[PDB]
């Protein structure tokens, strides 16, 4: 996260770290959506242009974390994966369309002050809140700058406004789809902030003013550089992929 700040303790209790077993390193962010299911970006697990194709036994999920690198004894919980599910129409060849994956945990995780699931939005909550200018919140342990202050000691947080779709489209040569939205400040707005490498797969959340609950509207998906003027971060549109999420969980849960 570029131009963010340290999270408060328990601020993002659904935040998950995808952790490579060997070598031991951060792979991606993710989010907890129930006691057994974790949501991430498909490109965190499968991206053939970079020879990335992880299997369940390659990875662990670490839940309840705040420090990036420390083993947070008595706070974090580490879970193994039973199965990965990648959207069957995930477009890794072109533009990361439908950049979404689910991971089922081997055993349910115990909730705590530091571990708690986020909601996924209904049609009406999505329609009300996914509007240009409305701000959401992105969290992760990724890079603090596009090139390298390099990597953070603790989880970082930034609040960013959703951008009008024509502005998103006009900022890039990549083909954007209805399964994506973009967020970030414009050059004239002064303020800054963005996701970056390592934040992939983490959540873009909004706090509903109707029921005071947090909803995950997006998944950190792609950008061109990090925090560049006139560029924006792109997020998988969670609601647009609801039918697939529900089909996977209804069938394999």
């Amino acid at each position: 996260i570029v131009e963010g700040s340290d999270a408060e303790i328990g601020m993002s209790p659904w935040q998950v770290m995808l952790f490579r077993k060997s070598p031991q390193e951060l792979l991606c962010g993710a989010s907890l959506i129930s006691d057994r299911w974790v949501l991430t970006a498909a490109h965190c697990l499968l991206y053939p242009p970079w020879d990335k194709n992880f299997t369940e036994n390659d990875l662990l999920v670490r839940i309840g974390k705040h420090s990036r690198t420390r083993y947070e004894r008595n706070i974090e919980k580490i879970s193994m994966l039973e199965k990965i599910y990648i959207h069957p129409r995930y477009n890794w060849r072109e533009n990361l369309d439908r950049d979404i994956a689910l991971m089922k945990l081997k055993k349910p995780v115990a909730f705590s002050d530091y571990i708690h699931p986020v909601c996924l939005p209904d049609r009406e909550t999505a329609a009300s809140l996914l509007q240009a200018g409305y701000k959401g919140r992105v969290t992760g342990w990724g890079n603090l700058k596009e090139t390298w202050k390099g990597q953070p000691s603790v989880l970082q947080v930034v609040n960013l406004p959703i951008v009008e779709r024509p502005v998103c489209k006009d900022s890039t040569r990549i083909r954007i789809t209805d399964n994506m939205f973009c967020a970030g400040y414009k050059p004239d707005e002064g303020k800054r902030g963005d996701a970056c490498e390592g934040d992939s797969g983490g959540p873009f959340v909004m706090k509903s003013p109707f029921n005071n609950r947090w909803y995950q509207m997006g998944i950190v998906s792609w950008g061109e550089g990090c925090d560049r003027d006139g560029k924006y971060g792109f997020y998988t549109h969670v609601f647009r992929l609801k039918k697939w999420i529900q089909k996977v969980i209804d069938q394999f849960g």
Binding site: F19, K21, Q24, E25, L60, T69, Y71, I78, M80
Partner: peptide
């Protein structure tokens, strides 16, 4: 750069 995690999680 990461602190080792308990061995039980790598079995």
């Amino acid at each position: 750069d990461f602190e080792e995690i308990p061995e039980e999680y790598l079995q």
